Structure 1
Amino acid sequence: ARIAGINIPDHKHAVIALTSIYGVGKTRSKAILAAAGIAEDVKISELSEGQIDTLRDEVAKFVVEGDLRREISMSIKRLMDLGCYRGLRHRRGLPVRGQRTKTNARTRKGPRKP
């Protein structure tokens, strides 16, 4: 049960199972399923090889898994290089998107030390 690199859960329903792939969430999974011609309810158990192949192909059509990671990462790197406000934020480990830092930055800040 491999698709676009990584393994997919054998028991889980396709819509959800697909979501395991980095670069597909729910909507994209659904789209993929539609493209294939498969229902959402079916599992990877009771799913044919030919059927799988089509799905895989569909997935390939999107920028997914390692490629996506490479892209996003690259963007971040570029930003950092630029030294744009966003870049600066990224470098510091502070909220990029314009949040308060006085309090509640703990995701990007990390778990508080003192």
Structure 2
Amino acid sequence: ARIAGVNIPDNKHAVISLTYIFGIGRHTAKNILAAVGITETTKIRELDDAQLDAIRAEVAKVPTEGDLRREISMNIKRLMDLGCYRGLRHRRSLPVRGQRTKTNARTRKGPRKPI
């Protein structure tokens, strides 16, 4: 099926399939299915068009994909523009939540660089 603009897997159960959308986790999928009425373990290929429409309508009430990406970018850019300590860390591409930088910062600062 194609939900919220992406093609989710068809053979996987509904809860696992719906977490393939940027902005939906297991809890959110678990709540959407409960709200609509579809059983948790039903495969995607076994849903009818009306149930697919119901899921597609339920997905509309939470931020997803492009909108959520835009909002996160807006927050980070606002921090960098303002210039507080957190924005300075974002500019420098260093840890933002107070972790040590003497060692062990490879996720933020990328692979090692020779001198």
The SS at the match of 1:79 is: helix
Distance 2:38 2:77 in 1: 39
Measure how far apart 1:106 and its partner are: 0.8
Structure 2 partner of 1:80: 80
The letter for the 1-side match of 2:33 is L
Query: Taking every aligned residue pair, what percent have the same amino acid on both sides?
Result: 75
TM-score (norm 1): 0.95
| Bigger radius of gyration among the two | 2
Q: TM-score, normalised by structure 2?
A: 0.94
Q: Give the aligned partner of residue 103 of structure 2.
A: 103
Secondary structure at the residue paired with 2:113?
Answer: coil
Root-mean-square deviation (Å): 0.9
Other-structure match for 2:51: 51
Cα distance in 2 for residues equivalent to 1:48 and 1:104: 50
Alpha-carbon distance between aligned partners in 2 of 1:33 and 1:112, rounded to the nearest angstrom: 45
Runs of 4+ in 1 over 2 A off after TM superposition: none
Long gaps (5+) in structure 2: none
Unmatched segments (≥5 aa) in structure 1:
none
